[PDB]
């Protein structure tokens, strides 16, 4: 007789040859969760080898420039307040005159 008669008896999971996309789909697969506890796995070898020996961990060369890139984000994404309802009747004044201090005939403020 032949063989065709395997409905519960194999699903799928005996032969790659069943399938070729799933085939490759499992062994790319399998390499990357390696690369992933293989990269790692050396790398505790080579921290715990030297600890903190062969590594720097210390690199404060630009002190300043930690202080500057810092708040050069927060300067600029910032940029001082945009919310109006949290700002007083000043600070609200100080954005919008802010902006029409350099070039203005009228202004963005149709409301008070």
């Known amino acids: 007789h032949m063989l065709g008669l395997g409905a519960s008896d194999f699903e799928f999971g005996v032969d790659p040859s069943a399938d070729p996309e799933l085939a490759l789909a499992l ?3 399998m390499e990357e969760q390696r690369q992933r506890q ?5 790398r ?4 715990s080898a030297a600890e903190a020996g062969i590594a720097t961990t210390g690199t404060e060369d630009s002190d300043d420039a930690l202080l ?6 927060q300067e ?3 940029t001082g307040l945009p919310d109006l309802s ?9 954005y ?3 902006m029409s201090l350099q070039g203005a005939e009228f ?6």
């Open 27 to 29: 062994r790319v697969s």
């Open 38 to 42: 293989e990269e790692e796995a050396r």
């Open 44 to 47: 505790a070898a080579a921290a």
């Open 68 to 73: 500057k890139m810092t708040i050069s984000q």
């Open 76 to 78: 600029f994404g910032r």
């Open 86 to 94: 949290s700002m007083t009747e000043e600070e609200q004044i100080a």
């Open 96 to 98: 919008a005159m802010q």
């Open 107 to 112: 202004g963005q403020a149709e409301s008070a």
